[PDB]
Structures are given as C-alpha cells and as structure tokens.
C-alpha cells in the first residue's frame with residue numbers, strides 16, 4: 001500500500017505545515033502538523049477545555065462508530081517551546097492520503113497550552129519520530145508510520161516541504177520525479193528516539209565548505225534551523241547589521257539586508273538553502289528589524305534541521321530494519 005497527501009504552510013512565513021488526516025467512521029478530517037521530532041498523534045477534541053479551543057476543528061470520538069476508549073490510558077507532552085497538551089486515548093481508524101491504519105492510538109486533548117489555542121490552523125500533531133518516544137501511559141503506543149510500515153510497498157515515508165508553496169508527504173514509495181540528481185543516504189541513530197544524523201559540514205554563501213561533524217535531528221515539526229553557536233555566528237557575520245538580541249530571543253537583521261545562502265553537507269553531497277528561506281519577517285508588525293531563520297542550538301541542547309533546512313530538500317525517512325535518512329536537491 002501507499003499514501004500521498006498535500007502539506008500546506010499555515011501562513012506566509014512557512015511557520016508550520018498542515019496535512020489533512022481522516023479520523024474515525026464516518027471520517028472526521030482534521031489538519032495535523034506532521035512532526036518527525038515527536039511520536040504522539042494528538043488532536044483537539046470534544047473533550048478539550050472549551051476556553052482552550054479557538055477556531056480548531058475537533059475530533060468527537062462519540063460520533064465515530066470505530067472509536068474505542070483506551071481504558072485508563074493518558075498522555076501528556078511538552079515541546080521545546082514551552083507548549084504542552086494532555087488528555088486521554090482512543091483507538092480509531094486513521095487515513096492519510098489513501099493509506100489506512102485501523103486501531104491507531106488517537107490522543108484526545110483535555111488540555112492544551114496557549115500557543116496551541118492561539119494557532120487556529122493546527123488541529124493537532126501527527127508524530128513520526130520513533131515510537132519509543134510516545135507518551136501514552138501506562139501502556140506506550142505506536143506511531144501511524146510504525147503501524148502502517150509492514151503494509152507499505154517499502155518501509156519509508158518522504159517529506160517534500162514547499163517554500164511558500166504546496167508540498168507532499170508520501171508513504172510507501174519514493175517519487176523519483178520529485179528531486180534532481182541522486183538521493184544521498186546517511187546513517188541514523190535512534191538512541192534518542194529521533195531521526196538523528198551527522199551532517200558533514202557547512203558553507204555560508206559562496207564561502208568555502210567547512211568540514212565538521214554536526215549531529216542533529218531531521219525535524220519537520222520545528223520551524224527554524226538550530227545549529228551550534230559557532231556556526232550561527234559565522235552565518236550572521238555575513239549579514240550587515242545582524243545581531244543577536246536577548247530581548248527578541250535570537251539573531252535579527254535589517255529587513256532590507258541581502259541574506260546569503262546556507263549549505264549543509266550530507267556525506268559528500270550538499271544541500272543549498274537559499275538566502276530568502278532564512279527570512280522570517282518583521283519582529284513585530286511594521287518593524288524594519290527581521291527575525292532570522294538560523295538560530296543557536298546552545299539553549300535547546302540538540303541541533304535541529306527544521307523546516308528551513310528540510311524544505312530545501314526532498315527527504316527520505318527510511319524505516320528499514322536499520323533506519324537511514326536520504327536527502328536530495330530539488
């Protein structure tokens with residue numbers, strides 16, 4: 001089997017991407033944030049505190065003839081931005097782009113934090129990291145991909161995120177028309193439950209490539225590119241007037257500045273992020289100071305190849321017995 005769905009930026013800055021997902025019988029379609037950095041499928045629901053729902057589409061398990069309450073099961077998650085959510089658990093039928101899993105754990109939110117409430121376009125998350133990170137207690141649950149994997153034509157999914165444009169998540173096959181050149185595969189460590197890999201180095205603009213090992217995660221659920229302080233300082237030094245602002249919480253730059261590209265290494269291959277992918281616009285409406293899309297990972301403790309990086313590539317999440325990651329230019 002295979003599945004294919006379109007993923008859409010939530011706003012003009014590509015702050016996140018949403019993908020439609022069918023849950024239950026009859027189907028209830030929710031727009032979920034596919035997140036390769038976490039492993040819970042959770043949704044706004046009929047059980048979510050009313051004051052914490054503001055425009056989202058909700059899952060109502062009582063209207064799904066295939067929903068079954070998972071007795072005594074609960075979940076609770078926190079993310080790197082201080083946001084959180086929690087609730088109870090159902091199993092139900094979930095479909096993505098024609099690919100159907102029966103008995104998928106659907107984590108119904110009783111509570112969500114303010115950032116979630118404030119984003120009306122995101123109805124929940126669909127985790128695609130390793131199932132070892134799933135938070136359901138007292139019995140941990142499997143991701144949509146883990147549940148689907150044995151039925152897929154090939155045990156893979158791909159992320160093709162657009163810059164200010166539509167994109168695609170495919171399950172079970174590699175669309176060889178979606179990229180240029182070859183896909184370079186690189187080793188993955190699952191020891192932290194992430195799609196964790198080691199980049200071979202970087203360049204800034206037309207500068208010389210610096211060979212250096214950068215361990216980080218391929219994370220579709222993180223907006224920006226988080227890299228070591230040394231690397232980030234080297235990037236922003238090439239932007240006139242850029243500075244790190246404690247008040248704003250990272251590097252900012254004059255909105256009229258020309259941003260250089262940023263290149264990262266995948267083995268001997270190179271993925272080039274165009275400069276404009278790094279522009280996250282005015283820090284507040286009407287300001288001529290703009291937020292940067294490459295930021296230090298010093299505070300977070302791990303390097304993150306988020307959407308800024310991934311949308312410059314066609315990315316293969318290969319869930320073979322020994323998982324690997326593939327990157328191609330496009």
Ligand SMILES: O[C@H]1[C@H](NCc2cnc3ccccc3c2)[C@H]2CO[C@H](O2)[C@@H]1N1CCOCC1
Pocket residue numbers: 006007160166167168175177178179
């Ligand atoms: O247009 C190309 C697409 N470009 C990015 C993309 C991704 N996702 C998108 C989703 C919706 C609308 C548009 C989308 C566009 C990707 C995905 O498929 C192929 O490469 C496709 N053709 C390549 C040439 O022969 C085959 C067709």
Ligand SMILES: O[C@H]1[C@H](NCc2cnc3ccccc3c2)[C@H]2CO[C@H](O2)[C@@H]1N1CCOCC1
Pocket residue numbers: 015016079080081082119221222223224300304
């Ligand atoms: O990008 C962040 C994610 N939120 C994306 C998001 C969603 N919606 C948004 C809507 C508007 C403007 C911006 C938005 C940003 C979540 C999941 O993990 C973290 O928090 C992640 N990083 C936080 C900073 O360092 C750690 C990694």
